[PDB]
Design a binder for these strands. Sequence first.
RNA 1: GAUAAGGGAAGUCGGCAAAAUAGAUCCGUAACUUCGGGAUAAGGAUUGGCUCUAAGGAUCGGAACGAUCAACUUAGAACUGGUACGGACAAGGGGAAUCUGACUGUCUAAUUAAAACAUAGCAUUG
RNA 2: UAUCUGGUUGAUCCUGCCAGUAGUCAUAUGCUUGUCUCAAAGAUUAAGCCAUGCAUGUCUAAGUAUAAGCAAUUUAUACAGUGAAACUGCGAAUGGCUCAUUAAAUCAGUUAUCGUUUAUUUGAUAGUAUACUUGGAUAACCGUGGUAAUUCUAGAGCUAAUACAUGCUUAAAAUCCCGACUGUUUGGAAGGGAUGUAUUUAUUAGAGAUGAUUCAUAAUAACUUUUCGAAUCGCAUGGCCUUGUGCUGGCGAUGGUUCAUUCAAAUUUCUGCCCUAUCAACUUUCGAUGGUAGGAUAGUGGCCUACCAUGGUUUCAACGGGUAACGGGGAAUAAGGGUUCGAUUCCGGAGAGGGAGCCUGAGAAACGGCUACC
RNA 3: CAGCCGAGCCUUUUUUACUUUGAAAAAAUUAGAGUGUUCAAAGCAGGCCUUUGCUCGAAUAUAUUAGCAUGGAAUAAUAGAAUAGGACGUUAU
RNA 4: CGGCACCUUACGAGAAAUCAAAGUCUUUGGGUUCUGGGGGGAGUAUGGUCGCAAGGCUGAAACUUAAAGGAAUUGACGGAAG
RNA 5: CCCGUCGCUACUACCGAUUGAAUGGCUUAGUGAGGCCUCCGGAUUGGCGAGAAGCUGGUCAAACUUGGUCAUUUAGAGGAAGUAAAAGUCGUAACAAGGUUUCCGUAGGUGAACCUGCGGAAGGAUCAU
Lengths: 135, 185, 260
Amino acid sequence: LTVQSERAFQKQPHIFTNPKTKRWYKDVGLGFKTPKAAIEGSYIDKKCPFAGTVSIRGKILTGTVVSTKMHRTIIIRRDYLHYVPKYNRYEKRHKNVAAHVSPAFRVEEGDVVTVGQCRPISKTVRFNVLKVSAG
Amino acid sequence: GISRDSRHKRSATGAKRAQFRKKRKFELGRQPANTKIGPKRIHSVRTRGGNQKFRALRVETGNFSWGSEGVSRKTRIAGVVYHPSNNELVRTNTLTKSAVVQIDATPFRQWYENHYGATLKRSRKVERKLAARSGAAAIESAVDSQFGSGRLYAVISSRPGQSGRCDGYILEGEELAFYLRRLTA
Amino acid sequence: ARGPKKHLKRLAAPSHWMLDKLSGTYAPRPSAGPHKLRESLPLVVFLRNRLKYALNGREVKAIMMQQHVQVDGKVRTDTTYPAGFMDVITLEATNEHFRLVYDVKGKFAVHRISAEEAAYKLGKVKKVQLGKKGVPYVVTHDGRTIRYPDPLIRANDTVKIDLATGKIDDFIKFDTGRLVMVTGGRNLGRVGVIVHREKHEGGFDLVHIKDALENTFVTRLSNVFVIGTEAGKPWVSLPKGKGIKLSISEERDRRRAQQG
RNA sequence: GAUAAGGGAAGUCGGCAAAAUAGAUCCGUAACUUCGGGAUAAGGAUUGGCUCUAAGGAUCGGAACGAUCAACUUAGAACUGGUACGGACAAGGGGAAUCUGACUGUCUAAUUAAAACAUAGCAUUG
RNA sequence: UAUCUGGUUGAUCCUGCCAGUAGUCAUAUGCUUGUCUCAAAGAUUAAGCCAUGCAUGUCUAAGUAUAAGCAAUUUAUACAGUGAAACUGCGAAUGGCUCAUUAAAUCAGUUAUCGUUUAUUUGAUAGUAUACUUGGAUAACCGUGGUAAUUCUAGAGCUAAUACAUGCUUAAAAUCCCGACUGUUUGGAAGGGAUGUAUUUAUUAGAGAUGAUUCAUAAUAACUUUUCGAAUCGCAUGGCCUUGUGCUGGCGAUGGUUCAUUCAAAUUUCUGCCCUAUCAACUUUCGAUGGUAGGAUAGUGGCCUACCAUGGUUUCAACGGGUAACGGGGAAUAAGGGUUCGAUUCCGGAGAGGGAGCCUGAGAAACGGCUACC
RNA sequence: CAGCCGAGCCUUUUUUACUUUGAAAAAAUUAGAGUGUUCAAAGCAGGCCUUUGCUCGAAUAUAUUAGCAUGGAAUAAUAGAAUAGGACGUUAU
RNA sequence: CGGCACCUUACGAGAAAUCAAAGUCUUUGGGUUCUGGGGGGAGUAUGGUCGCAAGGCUGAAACUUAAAGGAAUUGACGGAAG
RNA sequence: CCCGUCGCUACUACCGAUUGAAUGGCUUAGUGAGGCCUCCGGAUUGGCGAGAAGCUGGUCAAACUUGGUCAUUUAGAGGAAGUAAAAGUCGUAACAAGGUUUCCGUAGGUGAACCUGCGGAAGGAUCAU
Ligand SMILES: CC[C@H]1CN2CCc3cc(OC)c(OC)cc3[C@@H]2C[C@@H]1C[C@H]1NCCc2cc(O)c(OC)cc21
Ligand SMILES: [Mg+2]
Ligand SMILES: [Mg+2]
Ligand SMILES: [Mg+2]
Ligand SMILES: [Mg+2]
Ligand SMILES: [Mg+2]
Ligand SMILES: [Mg+2]
Ligand SMILES: [Mg+2]
Ligand SMILES: [Mg+2]
Ligand SMILES: [Mg+2]
Ligand SMILES: [Mg+2]
Ligand SMILES: [Mg+2]
Ligand SMILES: [Mg+2]
Ligand SMILES: [Mg+2]
Ligand SMILES: [Mg+2]
Ligand SMILES: [Mg+2]
Ligand SMILES: [Mg+2]
Ligand SMILES: [Mg+2]
Ligand SMILES: [Mg+2]
Ligand SMILES: [Mg+2]
Ligand SMILES: [Mg+2]
Ligand SMILES: [Mg+2]
Ligand SMILES: [Mg+2]
Ligand SMILES: [Mg+2]
Ligand SMILES: [Mg+2]
Ligand SMILES: [Mg+2]
Ligand SMILES: [Mg+2]
Ligand SMILES: [Mg+2]
Ligand SMILES: [Mg+2]
Ligand SMILES: [Mg+2]
Ligand SMILES: [Mg+2]
Ligand SMILES: [Mg+2]
Ligand SMILES: [Mg+2]
Ligand SMILES: [Mg+2]
Ligand SMILES: [Mg+2]
Ligand SMILES: [Mg+2]
Ligand SMILES: [Mg+2]
Ligand SMILES: [Mg+2]
Ligand SMILES: [Mg+2]
Ligand SMILES: [Mg+2]
Ligand SMILES: [Mg+2]
Ligand SMILES: [Mg+2]
Ligand SMILES: [Mg+2]
Ligand SMILES: [Mg+2]
Ligand SMILES: [Mg+2]
Ligand SMILES: [Mg+2]
Ligand SMILES: [Mg+2]
Ligand SMILES: [Mg+2]
Ligand SMILES: [Mg+2]
Ligand SMILES: [Mg+2]
Ligand SMILES: [Mg+2]
């Protein structure tokens, strides 16, 4: 696994290392801790909440990872009970949400992650992983 | 015409969506500039809000920056040598952003020699000023070697189809080593 | 659909204008201006429905085209000019000065003020930031831009505008114990002191306010307007009722005693 | 042995004879069916030349890398021309049904190749 | 009013339906109809077709008046009142109508824009390194017309601008770069360039704001078919003498760059739609899910392109089909729970015979705008 | 004097669901307060000795899944220290 | 203790026949699967699927109809008994 | 009381040669208007610039022909049903031990009800030796 695996040079925009590697990162706020793999790492991800240019704002969701077969993208499954008033009871329902995961996190199917909303970074991705709990 | 709406796509589940409404003007697209190298030819585009964009159809020169030295100069663009998106842009010499180009090295060589005095009649004070600037005058080997050919490697930073400029910065460091490896292969 | 709306149906008008259903199909659509459409009071509504100086929209235009109506010390000839909270309306021909302050019932009171008090106004600081050439400025709730403010002024503070020069006389920092009027929500018009500000990062901060009758209510910080440095010391004259909310039973008792 | 305006089987017992189709790549393919087929069903697109690009290996050296060597296949692009290009050669016409024999096979050398004979399967007899 | 009654038997008790009964902001129809108030009304079938007329125009002291228009001589021989025609500006993107399409679409509640555009309103904001004021067009107008026919217009002759195209006028310093000469232990310097604001890069503050940013803002080096820092209009006419058409100046129109604000827009988070399995797999050629780079867009985004992975949805009902389906606020009936309806006075969406493409503009994929096909 | 709620001390002292409260939630419609439209359906008017003006008003509830904030910890789930890779040393080395 | 049943009673249930479950059901809520909604047309037609076939499984509608049906009572009748 | 062929009348739906027919949506392929962008072009018209027709290549893409598919209606010789009407012909299958107890599944036979074989059931005509 190497950082420079694309046809273009991978780097953080406008972060200049004068030859005569400097890394930029930020905290996302809302009491979420920046993983040290972002402060000290070497991966380049324009969509990472901590090392990229995306911002976390909107809704914070939690869910169970059900797919890690995409590159830097996971799908989480959110389970909830839908109330049916006529029968005064509930029915189990689920929604699948696609979220971006930065290389600062390691997630497998079955983990519980916390994702924060960001700007649309794909056709179906609007959430970006902020926290991981092993399962 | 060209439309950027997402209605014509099928959903994430794969279902084809029915036609909701006629194409709206606030979701239009236009055609690529496909900037070439030749005597300057720029057409204005009237955009939303009455604003203006510039299609660079042809440009010769651009503003290129030597980041380490903190100097920017206007210099000719020789040709496109590498493009991470499509190799046909290299073959046809189409200037877009992130295109690797060769720029004329003379304005930077002239600044370097006038600023430091080395190569790649003065007063006593001028010679002392140059001596003060000495020691910082040693540049990277991979950059120095290019001056023999009189052409530096650069990457386009502006968007020529959006601003009409074909500007960039001079390749340096491991980015220069990266694209050198790409070019030699 | 293809552009901005220019009409306002009568039923869709803000309820605090207190327009009648059957007088027509349309309502005065407030112009663009210092105050938002939903939180404003057009001068046609003020001069015809509130003061009853004009009998119709033709008459309110006749009144305003004679240069009588001033908003914040400036002549306005736009009959649908969006006058709003803390704005001063002057009709020097009748020698009357009004300030648009909410009453406890949720509406804009017809609140007459003295000429000395009509010479200034209060503005809630929405943002403080740097303009071009590194010049700081303050944006108040009525869209005013005051340059070179006191460097101690921050958002949610209240500034006192000279209203003739547009300058800042002095200010009130937002803090516990300050006198406050609520400018939004179901507690609109109530007056009390800040008891405790509860912060919610990424959400809405909530302010706990205690009435002069020791009634406590919670309202959004965006609905909180500082109007005084402490209890019983407002920087503007309060409308009749002092922003004290009475229950419907208390109001009925008060009306019974007032009317016999 | 060729060609033929317009029509296109009106010719004739009968489309006999001739014409039309035809290679390859890609797409698409119905009834019915003994599930094996039908099927190249039907029905469409492309194809030259030139200049390039990419992929697909072997042997050595302690190596995700270097050195040397090597076969024709496939895919993509630009350009180009009287829109031509399986350029000669070579090379299926197709479909809806009825009668009949299941099929492959066989015979009247020298007028009949068929529905005739055979056949597997079935049954009977000694 | 939380209600029942008639009908199977020779008679009985049941199951069970049929029938009766009441309402409908529920339609039609029959018969009948004196008064007052209030008031729906070509939705259903045909988003079928339309004769005719009207439905969007607009001028203030303050853009342009030599009407060969009217009116009076008046503070006026540049014009001066009123005022057709035209140019210019703005509006015509609102309103009104309808419900055909549309089943995670619309819509509702709830979010976001640290992901954008924004005429207008309201606040702020520009001394930047020929001038007593620049040009040449054109309309209306006059008179020659062509066509059967249109809100068609053509030659020729005039003439204006807040139309069009250009262009100066200015503080005081200070700072930076090159630098002849010079001092000669590294200082001084003549002389050249550059400074506002916009654009586009690259590199530095940002250790004032935010929950959070590569934010606001500033700086350095440049760049640009070089943005704009008023060649405008009305009323008053004042002050200083150095009495020269001397120098100064009062209230306003209109306009202008950027920021803010307001009116908006475009995308956008979460959850929620009726029947159908005689619909169980769907999507992915030729974008389906994701990654990298770009193009395009006002901006995010497979929105589009190139390359690369093989992903994405589904019995918690995907996909397909039906709807005599625009969604909601709501409506009818109602002990409670429910059932049924919502084309239709408000909000959102969509359409203007069916499609599609555009021009202008801040704003339209506009149809009482255009272009083409049917 | 009992009863009913709230407290505060002393007794060794991770994820939900649910329920409470709140904020924010268009008007019209619904329920509902006031008010002699001559009554009423409605409307949001109106009333005062008669006014070179005085003056009550234009309430209040309901929405309900989802989201936001919040109090409670019964009921129903969920996780933890078993090859200890377990917990504390606040100033342990 | 587990079974296969049986006898009595009816607290209780039921329209009744009867039922120790067919009880603990308007004083209506232990858990869960399947099925029915007046009689016919009709388990028919059509589509699918399984089967070599016979056929199985899934499965309508038009139309038609005021009853069809359950349990019991009295009588009448019986090529039933006494 | 009652069942089924058969005969008359009327209605509803079904099968059926006709490669039946009609209407609407989507779509392959072919052809392809027009605008927009781009490329040259350069009528004439200002002092090098502006610039019309037209041209090159793209892009969005209406529309037509063929084929495919989906959907909704509809004709049909003949065949085979159901119901209603009347109780017409033939018999007597069921209801009593209905005169051979009845019924279920299955398989043959037969003008028709039905009969027969095999295995079940009691809803039996036996709760019993
Ligand atoms: C000199 C040879 C030719 C001359 N040309 C003149 C033009 C012409 C045109 C035709 O029609 C346009 C045509 O029709 C057939 C035939 C001809 C003759 C045929 C002849 C060869 C031919 N002779 C008879 C048979 C035969 C057999 C073969 O084996 C064989 O191989 C060498 C050839 C032959
Ligand atoms: Mg469930
Ligand atoms: Mg409209
Ligand atoms: Mg916020
Ligand atoms: Mg011929
Ligand atoms: Mg011919
Ligand atoms: Mg023919
Ligand atoms: Mg013939
Ligand atoms: Mg013939
Ligand atoms: Mg003949
Ligand atoms: Mg013949
Ligand atoms: Mg032949
Ligand atoms: Mg073929
Ligand atoms: Mg044979
Ligand atoms: Mg022979
Ligand atoms: Mg012989
Ligand atoms: Mg022969
Ligand atoms: Mg009966
Ligand atoms: Mg209609
Ligand atoms: Mg109507
Ligand atoms: Mg309809
Ligand atoms: Mg019509
Ligand atoms: Mg209709
Ligand atoms: Mg329709
Ligand atoms: Mg306007
Ligand atoms: Mg991108
Ligand atoms: Mg991408
Ligand atoms: Mg579905
Ligand atoms: Mg419809
Ligand atoms: Mg209703
Ligand atoms: Mg509705
Ligand atoms: Mg409806
Ligand atoms: Mg509706
Ligand atoms: Mg309505
Ligand atoms: Mg509407
Ligand atoms: Mg429209
Ligand atoms: Mg119309
Ligand atoms: Mg049309
Ligand atoms: Mg219109
Ligand atoms: Mg249109
Ligand atoms: Mg019209
Ligand atoms: Mg018993
Ligand atoms: Mg028993
Ligand atoms: Mg039934
Ligand atoms: Mg269909
Ligand atoms: Mg018998
Ligand atoms: Mg018998
Ligand atoms: Mg017998
Ligand atoms: Mg018999
Ligand atoms: Mg026999
Ligand atoms: Mg026998």
